[PDB]
Design a protein around this ligand. Structure first.
Ligand code: A1L4C
Length: 295
């Protein structure tokens, strides 16, 4: 049962991460991620998280089950979750432009999901850093809010024991979105705060991607990924470090943005996610409060 109770209907994505399928469970739409054979530790970590923690939130991909199963005479690792037909924020930002209300809805939902991850709840969940946040890791829901997915690189911290749980995963984050301290390998790995600060850096990149797609003064930019103009597709590790650490570049913020009320708040936020000093960066909770106030 659990995975034998599921019919894989159509495969909506294939990539390094493996495969994502739309499928039926009880005649219900579910997402089914089938992990690539290279990536069993991400499956194990995510199964470990969603099983040992009460991790449920509007803006976090809703867990249904994890399972092992045979197909084509080989073991497959499955993670089954709610299904969101609109797909990834990354693909959404190419299929449409945004007004002010829908841009703010999107980024605030993301900040809310991320704050919920970052914040320990007592008697309950530990603090959780995501460590691979990106537009391709964020699902758009029918109601226009988003939810965060792909918890396989997650790190946890509990105040009761003061134990940092970094797990055992050789996988590293998407290179395009790696904060400088990850690229120049100076991140203080023993301090949980360092990982929250990595999620904030990545959140600023996503915030940048979204803001760009908001119409202001009747105009809008084509979708482009962070640093699209200084690194190739599938950027390499040294590709990113030279741009981020040596040149210390940031995605460009048009000056005009500071004449638009909404874009002004957004551009101020992103700049305070990109401080090269990780301790200078806003926290997720502060981002949520700020966006909650915007109009
Ligand atoms: C690869 C990123 N990931 C997306 C999902 C995920 C979770 C829940 N629901 C959905 N549904 C969905 C619907 C439509 C589309 N499409 C949109 C447009 N289409 C265009 C062709 O060019 C782009 C591409 C595909 C994609 C996904 N996906 C998951 C996942 C799944 C299970 C467990 N853990 C994570 N990982």
């Amino acid at each position: 049962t659990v995975a034998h109770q599921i019919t894989l209907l159509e495969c909506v994505g294939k990539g390094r991460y493996g495969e994502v399928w739309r499928g039926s469970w009880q005649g219900e739409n579910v997402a089914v991620k089938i992990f690539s054979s290279r990536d069993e530790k991400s499956w194990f970590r995510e199964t470990e998280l969603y099983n040992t923690v009460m991790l449920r939130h509007e803006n976090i991909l809703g867990f249904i089950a994890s399972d092992m199963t045979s197909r084509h005479s080989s073991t497959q690792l499955w993670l089954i979750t709610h299904y969101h037909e609109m797909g990834s924020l990354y693909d959404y930002l190419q299929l449409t432009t945004l007004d002010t209300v829908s841009c703010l809805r999107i980024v605030l939902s993301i900040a809310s999901g991320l704050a919920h991850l970052h914040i320990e709840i007592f008697g309950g969940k530990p603090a959780i850093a995501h460590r691979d946040l990106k537009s391709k890791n964020i699902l758009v829901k029918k109601n226009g809010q988003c939810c965060i997915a792909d918890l396989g690189l997650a790190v946890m911290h509990s105040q009761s024991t003061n134990q940092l749980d970094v797990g055992n995963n050789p996988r590293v984050g998407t290179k395009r979105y790696m904060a400088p301290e990850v690229l120049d390998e100076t991140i203080q790995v023993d301090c949980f705060d360092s990982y929250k600060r990595v999620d904030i850096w990545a959140f600023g990149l996503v915030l940048w991607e979204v803001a760009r797609r908001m119409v202001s003064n009747g105009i809008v930019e084509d979708y482009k990924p962070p640093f699209y103009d200084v690194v190739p597709n599938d950027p390499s590790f040294e590709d990113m470090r030279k741009v981020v650490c040596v040149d210390q570049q940031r995605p460009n913020i048009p000056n005009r943005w500071f004449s638009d009320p909404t874009l002004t708040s957004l551009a101020k936020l992103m700049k305070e996610c990109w401080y090269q000093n990780p301790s200078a960066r806003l926290t997720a909770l502060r981002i949520k409060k700020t966006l909650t106030k915007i109009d």
